[PDB]
C-alpha cells in the first residue's frame, strides 16, 4: 500500500499581465521552480523519475516540450520521462495529481508535479497564414482570450459567473465583499511574511531587479472601489466586474513528491501527505461550481468531512463561484482562502492549482492543522479537489 | 488487483499534410472516433467516467480544450472529466495510459483515450503582435516545425535521426530498404482490407475520405534512393522518402475495469498489461522506444520472443531501423502493416491510432502479446504491451 | 513658341488575371519590361529620358514606393532622369502620362515616359497593430486589395457607387448584362484578328522548367453566352442589386508604358508620332457616384480642345462597371460603337494603377488601326473623380 | 505667362516617432493642414480647383485615397481633383510643384500643395497571408525601414550617407558639430516663437491633449552626447551615428497656391512667389547629394547664383550629406537651416518637403529677404530643389 508525500513546495511570486514577469517565458518561470523546489526538498535532480507539468496556453515552440524543458533546465535528469498536461484552469493539481499517480503505482519512487503560465506572452494566432486568405480580411486571433471561453458556447468565462450568482443567489453586494476581504486577507498576509518561505525570487538585469512580491494585491483597497465597477461581461443585471474577478497573471509553482518509505530512507520530514483526490465535469455555462461535486468525491474517498478541513484552497476564479462553492459546500469563509486568492493575489491559468498547493501546505504547516483541501474550477465544465495531511 | 480492459478501438484514416482532412478540426476528428468508438462498444456516452486526449498543436482556442470538447461532443456526458496531455510524438498512447490509470486507481471503471492531431491546420504565430515589434521585420512563427525541432538545440528531429544513424550503423540502403517495404506493406494492407473495419469513414455531393492516402501504392526503390539527405548538409542518409509524412488523423479506445466489462458481457479486444516511459539523450531522441520497451517487458515479466505483434512508429526508418536492431525484434513482426513512413505520423494521434492498429491486427493473426511503442521528441520513448482476450 | 507633346511609342503587358499568369511577376519588373520596350519601340536610348512618372495604387513590397525609379533605371533609363510615383486610383496611369507630358509642356524637359504598373496579385495584408501592439482581443490582417476596392468616407466597395449610378441613370440589370457580353465578344474578335499583336510586349518567365512566355489578355471569355450573365446574381447589395461578377471589371496584373517627346524633338530624330496630346480634364463628382466622373472630365477636355462629341473617332472609356459605363455613354450622347471597339475592363481586366495608361495604349494602336483623327481616353476613379485626355494622329 | 503666389502656408508640430501624434492618422494631419491653411489664405474650400499630397508610408487603406480624404475632410469641395504623390523624402515639395504645374498650364487658378506622413502607423505587412506561406517561418515586413531602404542595393540610406561623406570628405567631427548645430538652432528658434505662426496645434482626447511643439528638439544637447555615439550603419570606418542622422517622425503641411492675378484680384498678400524648380537624378548609392544637381537646375532657370539665397531650407537628412551639400554649392553654413531641420525637428518622409518650404517661406518673411531655395534628397537617387521670392 504505497503512499504519496510532498517533500517540497515552493512557487515564483505572482505577476500581473504585462508586468514584472512580462519578459521571462514560461520554460525560464518552471525550470527555476523546479530547480529551487529540489534543492529545498535537498534531493538531486539525478534522483527524479517523473516530472508532469501544467500548462494551458503555448506562448512558443518550446511550450509543446514545456514538462521536459522545466525539468531538464531545471537540473533533473534527462532520464527522467516529462509530461504537459492541460485541465484548463485545474491543469497545475492536474499536474500534482498524475505525478502522483506514478509514484502510487509503483512507475517511480520520486517524481515532481508543477504549473507554469505566462499569460502576459500569450500569442496572436494567425490561422490563415499557411494557406493563405486569399481575398477578404483575415484574423490575428487572441490565444489568452481563447483560454478564457467556453468551446461551446464561445461566451467568457465571467458569464458563467454571473449564472452561477444568478443559480445560487450570490448577490453583487456579497461579491465586492469577497473581493475586498481576499484583497485585505493577502495583504495581511504578505506583510506578515507568510509567503517569504515559499517564493522564489526571479532576478532580472541600473542593476540588478528582484521579483519576489505578489503584485496584483492592492494593500489600499476600499468597499467603494468595488462598488463603483461597471459589470464587463454581461449587458443587463449584471454583478461580476474587474474588481470583483480574478486577474490575468503569470507564475509557476513545484512540487517535489516522494513515496512515503523513500523521504523516511532519506530523513526527510514531508509538509503533507496526499490522502485523497477527485474529479468531476459539470454544466459549461456553471463551470464555476465545479469545485463542489469534486470536493464531495475527494470527502468522500477520504472517509472525512466538512468540519475537519482546517485549510482551504479554492481557487477565487471570481467571486461569484467562490461563495457559491462556500455556500453549497457550508464551508467556513474564515478557512477557505485565509491569505486571499485568484482575486488579489491573480489568477496565472496553468501554474494556479500547483500554486494554490504550495500555498495550502505551507498554511498548513503555519497554523499546526492536520487537512488541507485543494480545489479549483476548470474551463469548459470541471472541478478538481485534492486533499492532503499534515 | 484491478485490471484495465480494452473493449473498442477505432481511427479515422490518415490524411496527408494539406489533404483530405485539411479542412476538419482536431476538435471535429475527436469527436468523430469518441462516437464511434462508443457506439463499436456498445457503451453509452452517459457511463463514461473519465476521458484523455493526445495532442501537441494547438490549431485553434478549442484546441486547448480538446479532450472535452472531443468528449462532449462525442456524446460523453457532460458529467465526465475530460483533460488534454502532451508527451509530444508519444501524446496518443500516454492519454491512453492516462485514462487507464484512472481506471487502475478505482477513480471510474471506463475511459476513453485518444488522440487528435491536424498538420494541415497547425497556426503560424506571431509573438510580437500582442506587445509590438516597434522597429525591424518580425516572424510569423511556424507552430508544425516548432513541434518537429528540439527546444534544446533547435534541431530538426531529422537530424537527430542522423544521430541515430550514425551511432548504430544504419546506412543510407538500410533506410531506404526499410521505407520501401513500409510501403509495400501499407499497400497489401490496404488491398486486403486490413484496415476496413477499425476506420470510421470521415464524409464532407459528400466527399468520404476513409483510405490512408499517403501510402504509395507503385514505390520503388529507385525513388527512394534518387532522393536527396534533407536534414544534414554533408554525409546525410534521412530524405522525405524514408522520414515519416506529415498527417492528420484521431483514434480513441474505450476502456474499463476488466469486471465491467464481464457485467455488460463485452468480448475486450485485449488487457493492458503494462506500459514503460524512459528518458534519452534529446539528440539520439529516436531510440527512446529501447528503454521504454526494456521497462514494460521487465514490468510484465516477458521477453522480446513473447511479442506476436510489435507496433513501433516509423518516425524515420533511420531510428526504427536502430530500434528492432539494438532490441533484436524480428523485422517481419515489427509493423507488419505498415508505421509512419508510408501511412503517416499524425504526432500527437499517433499513439492512439498505432494502438487501434496492434489491437485489431492481434486479433486478426490469433496473437497473445502486442507490443505499442514510439520515439518521443526531446529524447523520450513510451511503450505498452497488450494481452488479448 | 508653344511647346506640344507628342506620344512615339505606346506598348503594354498582356492583362494577366488575379492569380493567375502574372502572380510571380512583382510590378517593378512589369513596369521595367514596358519601359525598356517602349524605348526599343521609339528608337529612343534610356540615355535621352528627362523624366518618368509611374502610376500604381498597391504597394506590394518595399521597392514599390520607389517603383517609378525601379521601373525607369531598371528598364535601362539613365540614373540622372528624375522618376515619380503617381497616385489617383483608377486614373493612375493616365495621370502619370499627364504629369509626364506636362514636365515637356512646361519646358522641364524634351522627352519623358509616362506608365503604370499594378499587380492586385500581389496586393499585401497589413497588420496595423503590429508595431505597437494589440494588448489584447483579436486583431486584423488588412487586404489591401480591397482597401483600394472601398470609398475611404463611406467604406462602401465600388460596386455599391455602381448600383448608385446605375439607379440615377435608369440602367438596368438587362443594359448590363448585354453590355458586359459585347465586352467580351468586342474582345475576343480582337484578340483573333490580332489587333493587340503589336502593342503587347510578352512576359516570359524562365525557372527550373524552361521558358513560358505570356501575351495574350487572359481574362477574356471567348465562348460567353448571355445566360452566363443572366443566371448571375447582385454581389454588392442585397436588395434590389443589378451588378454581378459578371458585368463588373475584373481583378487584374498588367503593366504599360509611353515614351513623350516635344513635338520638335521628335521631328529632328526623325520619328513619326502615333498621335500629340490635344488636351486634359480633370473633374470631382459624389464619391458615391463616382462612376461618372468621365462625364465631366470629357466635357472638360472637349472644351479645352474646342472639340464636340462627333469629333472623336475612338474612345476608350473604362469598364469599371457596366452600370457607370452605360451611362457615361449615355450621359455624354456617346456611339456604343465607338466606344471600347475592342472590350475594356469587363472583359480584358482592369489593373487599376496600370489600367489608364494602358487603355491609353490600345487607344493610339487603334486610332492608327482606323486612320481616325481623335481619340479619347477616360475614366472613373474610386473616391468620386475622373480623368480624360484627347489625342490626335 | 502665367505666375504662381503662395498665399498661405501651415505645418503641425513635428511628432517623434510612437510620441505625440502616434494615435493621429495621416489623414486627419492632412485633413487639419488643409482646412487651416485654407482659413489662413481666407479661401473657400469651394474655390479649389486642385489637390496634391505627398506620402510614401501607406499605413491604412484610406492612405491610397490620402489626397482626397485630406482635402474634402479639410473642407475642400467634392468637385476638386485631389493626387497623391510619391518621390520619397521629395514627395511633399513634389505635391507643391505638382499643384503649381495645373495652376502654370491654366487648368486652374487655385490650388493645393502638401504632404502627410505618420512614420509612427507605418504598417507591417505580410507577404504570405494572401496565398499561403505553407511551411516554414514567415515574414512580417516593416515598411517604415523599407522606405529607408534603396531598393537596388537594399542598403539603409544611412550606408548612403557614408559614401557621401567619404566622397566629399566630411569627418565625424564635423558631421557632429553639424548635429550639434542643428539642435541649438532649433532650440533657439522654439523660445525665441519663430514657428508659432505657421504651427496648427493638434488636440486630441482625462480630457483633451494639444500638441504644438516639435517634440524631436533637444534643448540641452552638448557635443560630447553626439561623440560618445557610436557608428550605427556600417561595420568599420562608420561616421553616421543616430545623434547626427535625421529622426523618424509624424507631421502634416499645406500650402495655398494661386495665379498671381487671382491674389490681386482677392486683395491677398503673398508670402511669396514660385521662381523656378529643379529635379535631378544620382548616383542611388550618393543619394544624399541628390540636391547640387536639382539647386544648379534651379538657379538656372532662375538666372539666379548661391549669392542671391538669403535663406535656405535644405533637409538634414545625415549630417553627412547636408555638409557634403552646402560645402560642394558653396553654400554659407548660417543661411542653411538657420532654424535646424531633420536631424533637430525631425524628418516626416513625405511631408517633409512641404513643411520646410513653410518654414522657408515664413522665414523669408520673418528677415525680410528676397530669395529663398527649398532643396532635399531623395532616396533611390534623387534631389529636387525650388526657389521663391517674396514680393
Excluded at 101 to 119: F, H, K, N, P, Y
Excluded at 361 to 387: P, S
Aim: aromatic share 4%; proline share 4%.
Amino acid at each position: 500500500t504505497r503512499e504519496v508525500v510532498v517533500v517540497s513546495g515552493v512557487r515564483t511570486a505572482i505577476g500581473t499581465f504585462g508586468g514584472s514577469l512580462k519578459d521571462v517565458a514560461p520554460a525560464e518561470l518552471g525550470a527555476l521552480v523546479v530547480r529551487e523546489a529540489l534543492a529545498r526538498a535537498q534531493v538531486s535532480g539525478d534522483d527524479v523519475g517523473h516530472v508532469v507539468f501544467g500548462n494551458v496556453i503555448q506562448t512558443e515552440p518550446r511550450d509543446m516540450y514545456l514538462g521536459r524543458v522545466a525539468a531538464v533546465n531545471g537540473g533533473v535528469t534527462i532520464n527522467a520521462p516529462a509530461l504537459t498536461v492541460n485541465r484548463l484552469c485545474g491543469s497545475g493539481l492536474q499536474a500534482i495529481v498524475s505525478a502522483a499517480q506514478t509514484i502510487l503505482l509503483g512507475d517511480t519512487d520520486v517524481a515532481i508535479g508543477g504549473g507554469a503560465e505566462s499569460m502576459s506572452r500569450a500569442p496572436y494566432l494567425a490561422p490563415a497564414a499557411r494557406w493563405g486568405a486569399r481575398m477578404g480580411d483575415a484574423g490575428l486571433v487572441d490565444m489568452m482570450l481563447g483560454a478564457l471561453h467556453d468551446p461551446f458556447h464561445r461566451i467568457h468565462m465571467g458569464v458563467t459567473a454571473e449564472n452561477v450568482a444568478k443559480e445560487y443567489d450570490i448577490s453583487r453586494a456579497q461579491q465586492d465583499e469577497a473581493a475586498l476581504e481576499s484583497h485585505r486577507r493577502a495583504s495581511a498576509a504578505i506583510k506578515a511574511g507568510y509567503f517569504k518561505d515559499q517564493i522564489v525570487p526571479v532576478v532580472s538585469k541600473k542593476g540588478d531587479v528582484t521579483f519576489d512580491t505578489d503584485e496584483h494585491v492592492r494593500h489600499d483597497a476600499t468597499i467603494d472601489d468595488m462598488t463603483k465597477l461597471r459589470p464587463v461581461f454581461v449587458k443587463e443585471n449584471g454583478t461580476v466586474t474587474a474588481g470583483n474577478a480574478s486577474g490575468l497573471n503569470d507564475a509557476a509553482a513545484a512540487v517535489v513528491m516522494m513515496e512515503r518509505a523513500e523521504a523516511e530512507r532519506r530523513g526527510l520530514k514531508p509538509l503533507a501527505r496526499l490522502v485523497s483526490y477527485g474529479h468531476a465535469g459539470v454544466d459549461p455555462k456553471a463551470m464555476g461550481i465545479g469545485p463542489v461535486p469534486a470536493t464531495k468525491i475527494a470527502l468522500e474517498r477520504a472517509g472525512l468531512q466538512v468540519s475537519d478541513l482546517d485549510v482551504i484552497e479554492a481557487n477565487e476564479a471570481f467571486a461569484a463561484q467562490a461563495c457559491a462553492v462556500t455556500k453549497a459546500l457550508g464551508l467556513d469563509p474564515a478557512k477557505v482562502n485565509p491569505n486571499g486568492s485568484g482575486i488579489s493575489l491573480g489568477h496565472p491559468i496553468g501554474a494556479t492549482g500547483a500554486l494554490i498547493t504550495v500555498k495550502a501546505l505551507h498554511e498548513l504547516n503555519r497554523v499546526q492543522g492536520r487537512y488541507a483541501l485543494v480545489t479549483m474550477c476548470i474551463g469548459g465544465g470541471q472541478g478538481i479537489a485534492a486533499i492532503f495531511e499534515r
